[PDB]
Amino acid sequence: TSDAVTFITYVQSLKRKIKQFEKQVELYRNGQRLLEKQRFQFPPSWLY
Amino acid sequence: SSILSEVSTRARSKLPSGKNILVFGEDGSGKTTLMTKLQGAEHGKKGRGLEYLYLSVHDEDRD
Amino acid sequence: FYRNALTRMPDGPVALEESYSAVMGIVSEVEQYVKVWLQYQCLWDMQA
C-alpha cells in the first residue's frame, strides 16, 4: 500500500499544478497566435 | 552564388487560396441577390452570361 | 427591355468567348508579373 499511497500523493500534488498548467496552455495558445499574426519564422526545432 | 536565394526557399507556411465556386440558377431566380448577400451587399447586377464576384472570408485565428 | 442579343449573335459565342479569353490572359499576365515581383516579401520573414 506504500506504493499506492505514494502514487496517490504524487497525483494529488499534480492536482494543484493542473490548473496552473491549464492557464499556461491558454496563455501559450495566446502567445503562439500572436507570434503567428506577428509573422515570425518558427524554427525547425519548434515543437507545435 | 545563390545562398541568399536558397535560404529564402524555406518559407515557414502558407494559407489557403485560389478556391472557386460554380453555380447554376435559372434566369432571375435571385441567384445574384443571394450570392451578393453572402458577402453582405444588397444587390449586385443581374446580367447575361457568366458573372463574377467575391467571397469575403476572414479568419480571426489566423488574422 | 430586350435581352436576347446573345442568342441573336450572328457569329456565335466566339466573340464573347474571345473577349473572356482576352480578360483572362490580361489578368494571368498581371498575376504572373506580381508573383515574381511579390516574391521579395519573403526577405523579412527570415531574420538575420
Side-chain angles (χ1 to χ4, degrees), chain A residues 38-43, chain C residues 41-42 44-47:
Chain A
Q38 292 330 108
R39 197 179 76 142
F40 157 79
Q41 197 82 354
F42 287 75
Chain C
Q41 70 90 31
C42 73
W44 175 248
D45 291 298
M46 263 194 183
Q47 53 271 35

Side-chain angles (χ1 to χ4, degrees), chain C:
Chain C
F1 72 113
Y2 173 75
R3 311 199 76 232
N4 212 2
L6 276 297
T7 70
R8 213 48 180 172
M9 186 66 203
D11 290 0
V14 182
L16 194 59
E17 174 151 29
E18 69 176 293
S19 76
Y20 276 89
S21 308
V23 178
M24 65 86 71
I26 298 299
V27 67
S28 57
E29 198 274 349
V30 163
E31 57 86 17
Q32 280 309 116
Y33 178 85
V34 165
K35 168 171 36 169
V36 57
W37 178 252
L38 189 148
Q39 183 51 74
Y40 297 161
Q41 70 90 31
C42 73
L43 189 151
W44 175 248
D45 291 298
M46 263 194 183
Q47 53 271 35

